[PDB]
């Protein structure tokens, strides 16, 4: 399967990141990570919305469209942030640069 | 017959347990008269 | 929890490499270990999933016959050999901790790759 | 069984499974599945 994902904005703006699957998901093996510049990659939220130990962050959706939400922009969520599918085997979309 | 093997095979809420015991014997009619107990092995 | 990999290593095509991870803070047995490839600009790849309770290994379908991976539960590690290098292969490779797959049954799991290596480069 | 030991444990799955008709149904511990 095949993910496809589609931001300027200030600090203080609610942010929307989106993700298409070429094929339906089982929506609970959706999950969503955060990359800053020079480090590793973060587990965000997994099972579609539930959120990650440590982690204004909220994920949902259905079908072959998912979307991840911040309520809030920080300087530190200037990040690319990826969506992973692993119900039939595991892909991730090319990634969301946030500035 | 040189060899003998024994089998208890019984089927209870689920589970097939296996009993069994081997020993040596020298008779080539049919099973020996005698008196032997057969172990657990397999659930 | 922590997973810490090897420095960087530069090789001519065709050579090989063999990337260690280690790691602690959990219970090495019920955790498998994902690689991740990531070419520069590029995005994530996801290249396999080994289980370091029974050997079983999940490949991607552009890494296989290609990468051999394998665990080593009594020094808390895990080694992925990447034979036949090219030079599409430049990428830095991460070693995560993996819950989206069960350890001890291999089944779909509901999680993700929680905690991550630093990512070792290989040219 | 009726001398059961063991525990019992369950939740909601309204947001994980639900859509969904893939949940087919009809001694101790059989399980038939024939069709
Ligand atoms: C099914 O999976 C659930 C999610 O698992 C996590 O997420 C996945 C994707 C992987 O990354 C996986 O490795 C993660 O664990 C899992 O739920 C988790 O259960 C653990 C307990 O085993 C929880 O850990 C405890 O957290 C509390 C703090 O919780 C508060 O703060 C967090 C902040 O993120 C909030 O989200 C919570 O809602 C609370 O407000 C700690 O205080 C606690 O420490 C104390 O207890 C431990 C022993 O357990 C002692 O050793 C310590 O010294 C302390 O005394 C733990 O750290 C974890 O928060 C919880 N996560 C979530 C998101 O709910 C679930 O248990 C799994 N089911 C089964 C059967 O395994
Ligand atoms: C096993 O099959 C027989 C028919 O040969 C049937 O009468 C019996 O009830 C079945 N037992 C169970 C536990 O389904």
């Known amino acids: 399967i095949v993910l496809t994902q589609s931001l300027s904005l200030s600090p203080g703006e609610r942010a929307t990141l989106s993700c298409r699957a070429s094929?339906?998901?089982?929506?609970?093996?959706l999950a969503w990570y955060q990359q800053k510049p020079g480090q590793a990659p973060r587990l965000l939220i997994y099972?579609?919305?539930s959120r990650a130990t440590g982690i204004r962050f909220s994920g949902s959706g259905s079908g072959t469209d998912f979307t991840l939400t911040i309520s809030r922009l920080e300087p530190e969520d200037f990040a690319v942030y990826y969506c992973?599918?692993?119900?039939?085997?595991?892909?991730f979309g090319g990634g969301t640069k946030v500035e | 017959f040189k060899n003998l093997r024994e089998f208890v095979f019984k089927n209870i809420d689920g589970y097939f347990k296996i009993y069994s015991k081997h020993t040596p014997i020298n008779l080539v009619r049919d099973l020996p008269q005698g008196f032997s107990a057969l172990e657990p092995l397999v659930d | 929890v922590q997973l810490v990999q090897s420095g960087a290593e530069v090789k001519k095509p065709g050579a090989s490499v063999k990337v260690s991870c280690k790691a602690s803070?959990?219970?090495?047995?019920?955790?498998?270990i994902s690689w991740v490839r990531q070419a520069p600009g590029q995005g994530l790849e996801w290249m396999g999933w080994?289980?370091?309770?029974?050997?079983?290994?999940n490949y991607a379908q552009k890494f296989q016959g290609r990468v051999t991976m394998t665990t080593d539960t009594s020094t808390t590690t895990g080694y992925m050999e990447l034979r036949r290098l090219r030079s599409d292969d430049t990428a830095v490779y991460y070693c995560?901790?993996?819950?989206?797959?069960?350890?001890?049954?291999?089944?779909?799991?509901?999680?993700?790759?929680?905690?991550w290596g630093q990512g070792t480069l290989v040219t | 069984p009726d001398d059961f030991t063991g525990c019992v444990i369950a939740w909601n799955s309204n947001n994980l499974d639900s859509k969904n008709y893939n949940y087919l149904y009809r001694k101790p511990f059989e399980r038939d599945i024939s069709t």
């Open positions: 803070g959990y219970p090495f047995t019920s955790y498998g």
């Open positions: 080994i289980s370091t309770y029974n050997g079983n290994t």
């Open positions: 995560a901790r993996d819950y989206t797959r069960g350890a001890w049954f291999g089944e779909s799991l509901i999680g993700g790759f929680d905690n």
């Open positions: 094929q339906t998901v089982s929506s609970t093996s």
């Open positions: 992973q599918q692993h119900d039939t085997s595991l892909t």
């Open positions: 099972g579609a919305s």
